Amino acid sequence: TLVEQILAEFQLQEEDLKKVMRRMQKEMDRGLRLETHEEASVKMLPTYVRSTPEGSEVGDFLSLDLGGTNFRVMLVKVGEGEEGQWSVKTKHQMYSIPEDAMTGTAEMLFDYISECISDFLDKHQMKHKKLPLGFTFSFPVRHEDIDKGILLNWTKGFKASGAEGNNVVGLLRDAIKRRGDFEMDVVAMVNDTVATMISCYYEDHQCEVGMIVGTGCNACYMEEMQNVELVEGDEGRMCVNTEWGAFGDSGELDEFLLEYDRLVDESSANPGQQLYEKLIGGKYMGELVRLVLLRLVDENLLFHGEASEQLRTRGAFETRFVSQVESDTGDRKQIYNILSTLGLRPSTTDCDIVRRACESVSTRAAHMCSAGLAGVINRMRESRSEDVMRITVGVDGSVYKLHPSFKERFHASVRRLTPSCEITFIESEEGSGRGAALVSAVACKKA
Numbered sequence: 152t153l154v155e156q157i158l159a160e161f162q163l164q165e166e167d168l169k170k171v172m173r174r175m176q177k178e179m180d181r182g183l184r185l186e187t188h189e190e191a192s193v194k195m196l197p198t199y200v201r202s203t204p205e206g207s208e209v210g211d212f213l214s215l216d217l218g219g220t221n222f223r224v225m226l227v228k229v230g231e232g233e234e235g236q237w238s239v240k241t242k243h244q245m246y247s248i249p250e251d252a253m254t255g256t257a258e259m260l261f262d263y264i265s266e267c268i269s270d271f272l273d274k275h276q277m278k279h280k281k282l283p284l285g286f287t288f289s290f291p292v293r294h295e296d297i298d299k300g301i302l303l304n305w306t307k308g309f310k311a312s313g314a315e316g317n318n319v320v321g322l323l324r325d326a327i328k329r330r331g332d333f334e335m336d337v338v339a340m341v342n343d344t345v346a347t348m349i350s351c352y353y354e355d356h357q358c359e360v361g362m363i364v365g366t367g368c369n370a371c372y373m374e375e376m377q378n379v380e381l382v383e384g385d386e387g388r389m390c391v392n393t394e395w396g397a398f399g400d401s402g403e404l405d406e407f408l409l410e411y412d413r414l415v416d417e418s419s420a421n422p423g424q425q426l427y428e429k430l431i432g433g434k435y436m437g438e439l440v441r442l443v444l445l446r447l448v449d450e451n452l453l454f455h456g457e458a459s460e461q462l463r464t465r466g467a468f469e470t471r472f473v474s475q476v477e478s479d480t481g482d483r484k485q486i487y488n489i490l491s492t493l494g495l496r497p498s499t500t501d502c503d504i505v506r507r508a509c510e511s512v513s514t515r516a517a518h519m520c521s522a523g524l525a526g527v528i529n530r531m532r533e534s535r536s537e538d539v540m541r542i543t544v545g546v547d548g549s550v551y552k553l554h555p556s557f558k559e560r561f562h563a564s565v566r567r568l569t570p571s572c573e574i575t576f577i578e579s580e581e582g583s584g585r586g587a588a589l590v591s592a593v594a595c596k597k598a
């Protein structure tokens with residue numbers, strides 16, 4: 152139990168969650184106010200996706216999706232249901248970002264994207280078409296409108312120079328026009344949360360929140376227009392992109408941050424930023440385990456003191472490993488093969504120890520996440536006048552989807568924190584591509 156004291160350092164009492172939930176609600180209120188929006192850690196960026204204005208055009212839309220390591224392009228067919236609209240990916244391609252598309256300028260990257268966009272249309276015998284473009288761009292943006300907004304600053308590792316501070320929809324067309332090959336109506340730009348929330352909404356009208364727990368972690372919700380001070384008008388409702396991943400950036404979380412958190416921060420491409428996300432996101436989960444495993448080896452408590460050449464390099468313990476280790480049936484084969492691949496020869500108890508480290512890190516990720524969701528939901532509840540508020544959350548993300556137990560721990564906690572709420576979780580089917588497209592089909596009955 153010399154180990155079980157090290158890992159206990161991940162535990163969070165319900166009291167700790169309530170504190171975090173209340174602080175989230177607090178920074179969310181600050182982000183929405185004129186006086187404090189500028190230094191707010193939780194920017195609460197308005198998205199200009201508005202309460203059903205009702206004006207949808209059917210037809211085929213192209214959808215981009217930059218935000219992961221695998222940039223995507225797809226075509227989607229929007230139509231007209233009894234509900235509202237139907238949608239469906241019809242054809243689709245994925246392309247790696249090189250690395251010279253990172254390190255260099257943004258234009259390079261958008262030219263690379265432009266290449267792929269064309270490459271897609273080549274291979275689809277459609278290069279001779281003019282389609283409305285939906286763009287899911289999963290980074291923080293200050294929107295002037297549904298189709299104009301600036302990159303506040305890259306997260307999740309992306310480092311492309313000269314992209315910060317600029318019209319992202321600008322840099323895009325900028326590069327689409329340096330092609331001539333094709334013409335695109337870049338109608339609409341959305342965050343992944345919103346994309347997802349929109350597509351879930353068309354499945355379920357109760358969906359007023361969108362959540363992503365994958366490489367990164369973030370959320371978006373339907374706000375009352377009179378509370379979005381950064382937008383003129385008091386009638387209706389606008390979806391607001393919280394950007395809660397940067398909760399803790401003004402120190403809100405210092406009492407919770409562990410050494411493993413401090414070390415992950417310093418070494419990251421975004422030091423001092425996105426602190427909350429760095430407790431949850433799958434860009435960081437495995438790195439936290441690596442770090443936890445290492446302390447255990449220096450304390451001579453695991454791997455019989457010694458450590459692999461690989462275990463000792465940043466980004467070696469992939470998040471998917473956390474996941475696999477937790478799906479091990481007990482026979483340890485699964486834990487062994489990951490560790491052996493890494494260059495280790497664990498024993499029965501090493502395996503068990505690596506298991507415990509994983510569960511400590513992902514259980515905390517889940518709990519910490521549940522507090523933010525509970526923050527958002529309980530805030531919303533203050534604007535709902537009915538004994539039992541029924542809300543629906545749309546969710547996407549590898550960590551949420553693929554990890555053997557996150558979903559379950561996550562739900563139970565969220566529910567403990569949200570009295571008088573009946574919550575529904577719905578997982579977005581292709582909901583990003585469809586999301587950007589469905590948002591386009593509406594903003595197109597405008598441009």
Ligand SMILES: Cn1ccnc1Sc1cccc(-c2cccc(=O)[nH]2)c1
Nearest residue numbers: 200201202203204352358359590593
């Ligand atoms: C998600 N939800 C639930 C209740 N109201 C909403 S917001 C919603 C629903 C359906 C379509 C749109 C939408 C898309 C693009 C521009 C716009 O103003 N609205 C916005």
Ligand SMILES: OC[C@H]1O[C@H](O)[C@H](O)[C@@H](O)[C@@H]1O
Nearest residue numbers: 289290291306367368369396
């Ligand atoms: O990709 C999911 C999320 O992860 C990152 O935190 C981004 O800042 C954000 O904009 C996004 O919505």
